[PDB]
Design a protein around this ligand. Structure first.
Ligand SMILES: Nc1nc2c(ncn2[C@@H]2O[C@H](COP(=O)(O)OP(=O)(O)O)[C@@H](O)[C@H]2O)c(=O)[nH]1
Length: 267
């Protein structure tokens, strides 16, 4: 019954939840359902959320196991054609929801836009196998996914408290979920732990990789580290997976002559 469902997880968000919801309620040209999944805030959050138009607004307020648990509860209740997730410190830009509706009209399963972070565009990557040796290719809050996308991919993996968004998108890529990237800003707003989860997520695509080899690939694609061992890694594991060969030749087009050699002998 709704073009869009916006899932907003909140805990102690009294400072910004107003600005967040104003960015959703003011969206013109769409029927929007809002599901606020609050983890039991003791501050003004519940009152502020209640100060908005409640017509299509549901409030869940109960303990949960973290951000992605709250997101899962909201996604599970969503009735909209496309489902977005907005943090309480985030805002959608004007007209974004209508842009999502328009770009979804042919049945694409994911519609993703750009993200503005401290006045700079997030350095996004393409939605393609090459993302599988990296992080999430677009900002998770700039992503909208259909009911069928979530039905087919499933829910967010709570084992990942940082990078569950990346792991979900990688599962989408591996499931050949369709995606359309829109070159418009949709949303504005312990490294060792982040790196550990990101390596783990990459290894869930390619279980033959050592953690250090997942790290090398990740730093390689992101431009944080050198790439002279990429060909070595390709020769080491190319026989394991055509997807992995495809990912490396997409991420590092210069290894094409070596990639074709892997394809030719094993795939
Ligand atoms: N329901 C729920 N929401 C949370 C929890 N922790 C954080 N949040 C909310 O999740 C959103 C993002 O949290 P934040 O600390 O900014 O993490 P980040 O934006 O993903 O880096 C905000 O809307 C918070 O209110 C939690 O344990 N439960």
């Amino acid at each position: 019954e709704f073009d869009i469902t916006v899932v907003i997880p909140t805990f102690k968000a009294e400072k910004t939840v107003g600005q967040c919801l104003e960015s959703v309620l003011s969206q013109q040209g769409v029927s929007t359902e809002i599901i606020v999944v609050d983890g039991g805030s003791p501050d003004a959050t519940i009152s502020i959320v209640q100060s908005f138009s409640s017509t299509n607004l549901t409030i869940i307020s109960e303990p949960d196991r973290g951000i992605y648990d709250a997101i899962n509860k909201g996604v599970s209740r969503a009735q909209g054609g496309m489902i977005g997730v907005l943090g309480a410190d985030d805002v959608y830009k004007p007209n974004v929801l209508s842009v999502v509706k328009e770009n979804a009209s042919r049945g694409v399963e994911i519609v993703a836009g750009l993200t503005l972070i401290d006045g700079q565009l997030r350095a996004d990557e393409q939605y393609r196998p090459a993302a599988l040796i990296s992080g999430i290719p677009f900002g998770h809050n700039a992503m909208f996914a259909s009911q069928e996308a979530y039905r087919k991919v499933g829910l967010y993996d709570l084992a990942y408290r940082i990078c569950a968004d990346a792991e979900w998108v990688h599962r989408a890529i591996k499931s050949d979920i369709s995606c359309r990237k829109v070159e418009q800003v949709f949303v504005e707003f312990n490294p060792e732990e982040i790196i550990a989860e990101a390596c783990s997520v990459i290894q869930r695509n390619f279980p033959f990789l050592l953690k250090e080899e997942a790290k090398y690939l990740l730093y390689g694609v992101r431009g944080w580290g050198e790439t002279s061992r990429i060909e070595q890694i390709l020769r080491k594991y190319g026989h394991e997976s055509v997807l992995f060969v495809t990912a490396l030749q997409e991420a590092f087009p210069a290894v094409e002559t070596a990639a074709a050699l892997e394809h030719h002998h094993h795939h």
